[PDB]
Amino acid sequence: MPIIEQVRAREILDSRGNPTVEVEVALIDGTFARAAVPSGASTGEHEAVELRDGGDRYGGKGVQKAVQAVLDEIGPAVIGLNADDQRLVDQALVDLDGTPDKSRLGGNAILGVSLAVAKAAADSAELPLFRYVGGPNAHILPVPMMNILNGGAHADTAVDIQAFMVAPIGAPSFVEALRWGAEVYHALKSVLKKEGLSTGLGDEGGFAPDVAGTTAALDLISRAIESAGLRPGADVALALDAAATEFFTDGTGYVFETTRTADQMTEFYAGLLGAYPLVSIEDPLSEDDWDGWAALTASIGDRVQIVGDDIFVTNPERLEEGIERGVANALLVKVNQIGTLTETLDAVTLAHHGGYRTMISHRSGETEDTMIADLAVAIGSGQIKTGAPARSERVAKYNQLLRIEEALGDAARYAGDLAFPRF
Amino acid sequence: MPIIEQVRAREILDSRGNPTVEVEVALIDGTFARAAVPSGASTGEHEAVELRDGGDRYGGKGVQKAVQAVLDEIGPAVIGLNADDQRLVDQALVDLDGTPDKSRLGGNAILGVSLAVAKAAADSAELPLFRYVGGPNAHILPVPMMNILNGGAHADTAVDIQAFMVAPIGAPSFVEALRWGAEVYHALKSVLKKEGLSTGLGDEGGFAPDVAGTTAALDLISRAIESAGLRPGADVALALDAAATEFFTDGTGYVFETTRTADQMTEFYAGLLGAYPLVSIEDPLSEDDWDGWAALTASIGDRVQIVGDDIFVTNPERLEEGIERGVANALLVKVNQIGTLTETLDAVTLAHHGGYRTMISHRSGETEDTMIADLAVAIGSGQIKTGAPARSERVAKYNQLLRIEEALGDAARYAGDLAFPRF
Amino acid sequence: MPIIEQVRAREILDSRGNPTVEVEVALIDGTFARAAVPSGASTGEHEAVELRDGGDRYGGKGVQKAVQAVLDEIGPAVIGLNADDQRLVDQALVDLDGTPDKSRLGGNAILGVSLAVAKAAADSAELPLFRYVGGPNAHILPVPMMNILNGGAHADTAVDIQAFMVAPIGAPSFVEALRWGAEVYHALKSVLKKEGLSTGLGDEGGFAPDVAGTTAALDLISRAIESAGLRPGADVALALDAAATEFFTDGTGYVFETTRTADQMTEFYAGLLGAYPLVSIEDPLSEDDWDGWAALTASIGDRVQIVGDDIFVTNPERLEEGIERGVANALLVKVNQIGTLTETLDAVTLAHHGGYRTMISHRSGETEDTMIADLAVAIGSGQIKTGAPARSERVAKYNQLLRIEEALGDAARYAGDLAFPRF
Amino acid sequence: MPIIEQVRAREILDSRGNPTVEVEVALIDGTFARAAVPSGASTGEHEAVELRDGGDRYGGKGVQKAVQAVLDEIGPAVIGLNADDQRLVDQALVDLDGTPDKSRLGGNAILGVSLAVAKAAADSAELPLFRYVGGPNAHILPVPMMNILNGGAHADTAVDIQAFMVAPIGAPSFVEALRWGAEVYHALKSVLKKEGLSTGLGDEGGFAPDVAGTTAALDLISRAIESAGLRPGADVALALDAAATEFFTDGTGYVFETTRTADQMTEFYAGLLGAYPLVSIEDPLSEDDWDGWAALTASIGDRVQIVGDDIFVTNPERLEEGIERGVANALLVKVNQIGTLTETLDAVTLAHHGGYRTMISHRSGETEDTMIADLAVAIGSGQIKTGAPARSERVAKYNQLLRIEEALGDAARYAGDLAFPRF
Ligand SMILES: [Cl-]
Ligand SMILES: [Cl-]
Ligand SMILES: [Cl-]
Ligand SMILES: [Cl-]
Ligand SMILES: [Cl-]
Ligand SMILES: [Cl-]
Ligand SMILES: [Cl-]
Ligand SMILES: [Cl-]
Ligand SMILES: [Cl-]
Ligand SMILES: [Cl-]
Ligand SMILES: [Cl-]
Ligand SMILES: [Cl-]
Ligand SMILES: [Mg+2]
Ligand SMILES: [Mg+2]
Ligand SMILES: [Mg+2]
Ligand SMILES: [Mg+2]
């Protein structure tokens, strides 16, 4: 019987050396599971609240209050529940907290317990996590959307686009797709050395060279793909996270490379589509620019995937508003933006039912936890955004997808160019 | 370890007294599961082939060849496989057969093994079948689309529409929705007695009274809903299976109540939408009328759900062609039209990803097997078509949904009017 | 019974996106364990040989030959052995290979199997890995020697010292020591931003700012410690990896910041000891400069720990030669330099018996594997070198030490300033 | 789970027929273990206190108070602890007692519980005791230091040296080394019969013939080695326990064979090194003669192992003082001198880290318990002092080393002449 017996939490460090929550759940059958919670560098206004300790300790970023909340309140509210009743457990966490944004117990305390319970349920059932969450039909390995060059608020350069990604869509399999991603990243390291540009890594393991702007960054990436013996677009296509909220002024406009309107940003993005093998653009406009996004999606949404991150925050409520308004055609899925597995899967359901694609995403503050790799296959997103093929908080996810591919055998299918029908 | 050890089959009878396949699978951990295969009265041209024995025995409808195929060939090909690898098992069945339409081993032999393996995997994992297929997020109880009055090729009347269904969309829960369906069906029995019309049941448990046509049948149903103390549309809405292939002549047109064109049938259906609280119409045109369907879906598809049954036959290939052509907005899901659980779930995936709704369906020849009730919740269709609340091959499904609702507790949600946003 | 039943290997990626070996071992009692192998960016001449595939794939760095060697040859030679007989298993791996430097099967294939077997033995015995390797007396949490600023061959600067580390020796506990390391690293990020220097990370997660030389780097670190509210030396002391082989010419001398002799390098190092709270210096001279090292150890060895890395390569044979010659007073312990757990522990034994201290070390190419954290406590080194508190291939080790500290309860002791009696 | 459930004690007799403590521990998984406590004939001033009953019974040497202390107080303080947490259990015993020298509960009550818990933990983990204490690297069989001729306070003769030992350093294996020890002991019996000297045994199973002094005793032993067909020094070397405290007067000097100073005793010992194949001398000076020992160790410590017994009493505190002062180069390890396994292993750690060798030792009052044989291999001392190859309280240890050698197979290594690099 997979009845919850014990729930504990501890403070560990994330991949930027800031504290985060790790939760362990033990079931009465001796099943033990452990889940760690990611954290964003900068966050959407609309995200679930992380409980942070304040004061001097770790710059105010301690999570001892979250840890105490798991031991004093969450444990006692969920011990005796069946870990298979993920929706009951998640509803009891949400009711316990009693707030819209999980500001009392913290989204970080609550997601910790939610993910650990799911992991314990899967172990008890003797099923791999992808198969317990997705059922026996879970088999699709995601195209890895790999951040290899950074800009925006995440850089000390004149590039305002936050992330430049490669997507090995033409690969026959996920094992070959990871290798393609790795070989282009290694060749970009060599191209950067040869141009005398910096090869220091950012948070996501990508390079942050000081370059002129968006097209200069895309040209270096294209050179890297060719240098790896691969064809841009057919083999390795491109994607962006503009994260346009970071360069947007409330009620004013987009300060980009020139102040521009939503419609001008769209002309820019349209220009990039004509010049480059772009399959996806994330957050091309800001998190509350509902009019701009609708007009942009109407303009270019037939030609490229448009991903809502900060505009949706993995929230069914804000995503429903977007589907209604014809805003974006894809949802970035961040479990810690919403706080429970159940609410994450309701958002994925709302998207998938509504014709929108999904992309599972890391946070800039990640851990050795690989659960999003299992999530990406469980929900059959066909797309994952979990960093450069460097820094093991990113690579551990890619290694877990290798293991999932191997375990599926001839049942595995790599999403490849079927993730992006518009390209 | 849920390794397949034994696979046996026997000939049993379906709900019309014709033979069908039942398969039992035993795993090395002592797990035992049993699955029975439904059969259609009349079938789509494009369905997986049922192996039938021919000769005198049971009118040519014996399934001893299918039973022998399970023992001589399928068992030996899948023993030693892990029952958790549903896609490997289904691929090995499809490769074993080696034909497009499963004409060598039979769709009936193959689906038997496929469904029994899935059931055995769920038992081994100690999970209810809905939760093993759908994962921990499976929680949505379907609106029951209950056939209470028949016509077409299934009748001796002037009604050409095959099925008239009630849909208790306004109910707060599936337990109340089943009761509403039952009380309207009982009141329709009383209305029919009072009009001197026949109360003999058809295959699906609905009545087949000799009435004038479509609007006469809808009026009697509306009287029944009011007689039960319920409001037509707000509480109990209406749906149809025209099954228009049954009154279509190849290259000619629709002989309906008058020969009509696809566009004329659409004017008729449009007329019914203005006069009646219709939420869904299945097969309004014939199985290969791709032009007619596109024009109909363009005309009324914003106003009502349009379900493809015979046009799609639960086939990813034919459904892809429909999505491309803007044909229908819903897929009728019939596991035995395609032959494996895996191919059924790929069709559901293709639909759900593509913005199309799904409705799990019985066949006119059903069994005491309740697996489609678990399927409807697993895939979160929000809709099931499994007969009148009479004849236990129909009622056993409704009873299994009660048990699933009870087991989910406060996690259960009834789809209600959210299954039909267009109404 | 912990009899080895199955041995498998797969190619995964390390923290620099290059391939490495991961090995899984299953025992007949159902115990399953997984071990990943690290890889050095540049290597000592004397290290165990890594089998690499060559050709185009992953730049020649594929490990498919190593993976095949684990499946074709190692598995068959160790299945049926008791996983508790670590020395028998390691001797059978060494005899199987039949070469001095493990050049036939590869140090990477062999260490994979060695570490996985040890992990499986610990799981079977139901003991944490630190307690199975070190016995019930294992309780000492290491001072973390955290690389926060890089130079040498690992940089594009004028600093020739490869690694600048902080050592929180004055902390009351490992949990406080990790926090001190994290807060100084965060304050160094702020000091670097304020001097307009690069905050891109190197392989070990440290910063690589373009600075003048050794004393400029030490001054920035000292500013960071003070900025964190900590006292240099008393709270946070300093350590170096000169890696002097990287700037040494065979038979010629040390090109450093000026060509210098071994004795001149020693005058430099002696100067740094008078000016800075240095507790340790690794590889102050080159890997085969036996005369230089003896004279340096005689000169300053009473005043500071002198660590042999490339001079010893975790080899009992080369370490014995050093003890005999009065060369160094500490051994850097790198399991993959020697290839088996058993030979690693014989080197630690030879050192500890001989009055030499040990420091467990990461490689620049690391994985999500945390086994060296368990090793550092098992052998009671009191010292570990496993990166900056950034990049989870480094932080996962620090998180595992937190978990080990918590599990020991009041039995835990933090090595603190007792790791460095000379300071 | 190896949780302590029951702790009982009984009074048994030691090898001299005096009472001692035996402790049994039962764990909740059904593991049962038994440990007996040795006792010294005469003791160091600084040893842990043995609780003795006083009065008439067994000459005042009853241990009923110790037995009662195990049942009334120790059991209740350690039941519910994990037997794997040896340091927590030992700390709880030390805190319970609350005294420096364990004078309240008794070192004999406390060591009984400590050793039984360790044995129970090893059984629960299904590991031999040497492997549970020493980890998988424990493999070194000790040179047996076998007392074959006695003098001092342990005799009625003019020999003031307490123990004359043979050390079969040249043997290829422990099985051959035991045989060499046995054959020399049998030949010494024959040499003694032929000189008309007594063949009655002392407490340690050695002979106590009435001889002239030290050189007369060494000559008889040398004759015995030759008579066995072995070469003195190359095959069988010699060692001494002077136990010089027994012939030392507080503040006065050494009454030996002549009153002598520390420096004169050293001239004597130096003379014996020139004339005889001596590898080790234990307690050459008295337990508090810190100046004498330093000067002696400076004089001859390069030429022979100098073992501290009564000067260290297996106490980390007194051993630290010796390492600081350059006093001795080896620690005699007597678990009952300190009272817990944990404090014994901290003393071994302090020694081994500090370049000092260890020799595990029996007490003159021994039992059928063989645990020190497992300890000697666990800590890889390479040396054990556990009597003549006569009297089964001595031989049971040698028999247990045979069993440990056999169980290690080709992983076993005999320390041989590598235990004594100075010879
Ligand atoms: Cl919820
Ligand atoms: Cl869309
Ligand atoms: Cl998707
Ligand atoms: Cl298939
Ligand atoms: Cl649609
Ligand atoms: Cl649906
Ligand atoms: Cl070896
Ligand atoms: Cl030294
Ligand atoms: Cl050390
Ligand atoms: Cl202690
Ligand atoms: Cl020494
Ligand atoms: Cl030793
Ligand atoms: Mg974003
Ligand atoms: Mg139909
Ligand atoms: Mg180094
Ligand atoms: Mg003694």
Author numbering:
A (entry chain A), B (entry chain A), C (entry chain A), D (entry chain A): 1 to 257, 259 to 424
Give the exact sentences the study uses for this entry.
Enolase, a ubiquitous enzyme, catalyzes the reversible conversion of 2-phospho­glycerate (2PG) to phospho­enolpyruvate (PEP) in the glycolytic pathway of organisms of all three domains of life. Here we present structural snapshots of Mycobacterium tuberculosis (Mtb) enolase in apo, PEP-bound and two 2PG-bound forms as it catalyzes the conversion of PEP to 2PG. MtEno has a topology similar to other enolase structures, a smaller N-terminal domain and a larger C-terminal domain. The crystal and the cryoEM structures (enzyme in solution, frozen) along with the biochemical studies clearly demonstrate that the functional unit of MtEno is an octamer.
Tautomerization resonance is accelerated on acidification of the carboxyl group of 2PG which is accomplished through its lone-pair-mediated coordination with both the Mg2+ ions and the transfer of a proton from His154 onto the nearest oxygen linked to the phosphate moiety. To find out if the exact reverse of this reaction occurs during the conversion of PEP to 2PG, we systematically mutated each of the residues Ser42, Asp241, Glu163, Glu204 and Lys335 to alanine, compared their activity with wild type MtEno, and elucidated the structures of three of them [Figs. 4(a) and 4(b)].
